[PDB]
Amino acid sequence: SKPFTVPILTVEEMTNSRFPIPLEKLFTGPSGAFVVQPQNGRCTTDGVLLGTTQLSPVNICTFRGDVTHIAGTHNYTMNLASQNWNNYDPTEEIPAPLGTPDFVGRIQGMLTQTTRGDGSTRGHKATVSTGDVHFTPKLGSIQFNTDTNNDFETGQNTKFTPVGVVQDGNGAHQNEPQQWVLPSYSGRTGHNVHLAPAVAPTFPGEQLLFFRSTMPGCSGYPNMNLDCLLPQEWVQHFYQEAAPAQSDVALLRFVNPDTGRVLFECKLHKSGYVTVAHTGQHDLVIPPNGYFRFDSWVNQFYTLAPM
């Protein structure tokens, strides 16, 4: 059987699987009080993609299609196409199109468009509110708020490139986005289906280990923390290697190459997430050259050395 491995990349060399930005740090905390069910950055160790997960880091939270102006507003409806401009297929047993945002919040970026006939182009700042009634990506349509009411043409290829998140209103600082609340992919009365499972520690004294980034902020006082369960590079690695899982738990050691010494160990669960033995919120202190190393498959009863 093909030996299992994880990439030798450092944390700072890797990319968040839930938004197109670099990883910054490792974080652990208790998660009993919310549902950890992200749909991006979901992949089994033997390379089966889950949820809305796809391979391209730059396609996360991007949208493509044609747009139509909503009269009397600066809003546009985007009729979604697939990433390669084929028809979007809503009948696939996935929660939403691959790469769809998996948090409730307002994502700002740019809408860009090319007119096929003459190659004329245009671009405008735009925001999609993934919590609003018009956000129905599973059904094939979403709405953008823009700074124009007449520039975008109908029947022309249009792309949304995400940049960051916004916050405003009378609510408390950092009250949005809500990274652990999935959008309603089929809108307000709809129910999400075909979801990658919720994850939770199941061994005494363990917590999830999160791969954390800080999302760019574009206005107000947003909560910019974004935690993923797997680096995008791990998703890409497992998909290609497709190494058989010899047990349900892979033991990883985090190693300092300058000394060769193990800083901590963690469990990489076959279904695609990581736990450590720790209690409480903690920003991990690591050497920037540190990296993860697979050491062995263990059984369900293995007790981690405290982090």
Add this chain to the structure above:
Amino acid sequence: KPFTVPILTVEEMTNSRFPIPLEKLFTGPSGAFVVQPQNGRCTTDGVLLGTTQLSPVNICTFRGDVTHIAGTHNYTMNLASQNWNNYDPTEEIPAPLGTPDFVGRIQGMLTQTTRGDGSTRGHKATVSTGDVHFTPKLGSIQFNTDTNNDFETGQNTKFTPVGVVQDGNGAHQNEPQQWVLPSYSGRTGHNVHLAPAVAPTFPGEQLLFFRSTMPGCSGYPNMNLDCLLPQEWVQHFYQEAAPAQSDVALLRFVNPDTGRVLFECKLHKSGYVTVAHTGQHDLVIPPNGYFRFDSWVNQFYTLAPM
């Protein structure tokens, strides 16, 4: 350690010169211009070259602090490193890693967070990489923005690229110029530490380009963007660091559904691909097709014609 390339399809991979997916393979003659891109440059045994770095999302991004140019909508950015450490202008690279490697106007957004209280702001911005103020190797560049007072000094500021612009007045598709390198030190110095120009010399061979279409944000831009290696190949070689047994790796492009070889190509050790073809051609490939390394060959090996 056996050399390999990733089993990813073209559409599953990413351009190494701009943060967008690959779309197609293209070959054409390149004698009439200089092919010296600085992003997407890596040896097969994993040595990064030019301004090439590992993150697909950091290509054509900038980070630093900004200062407003009074009476204008322009800002000067004093560059930091990708992790907000001080930028080291003495590093043996042409410019900060991920700096754009073509002359043109790149539009995107500048975003900023105030360290003290977590307030944030964001504005549309354009950087003109052909202008005299574009001196990333010196640690300074200029943006044109849609604000005249909002960005604060001494606060972390990021440029996220989106697409390219062209001035409608003048010939269509006259910019950007993807094969013209910026002057990374402006008029202050010549470019240094460049990945070398590539120019095939084996009879009947052309470069094989990994092509994307850049988003256009205004006017009539040339949106073609050709890279010599997919970003995922850069990432792969860097990690595997498999020894090169010769200067040329023979790859076959295969249809896994049939097992049939569509074409073969040379992956040169210094990091670029050639095919035996003459003329401009959009390759017709099956969507599940992928590249497979078959063997190391020598300087005399003749490819089966594409």
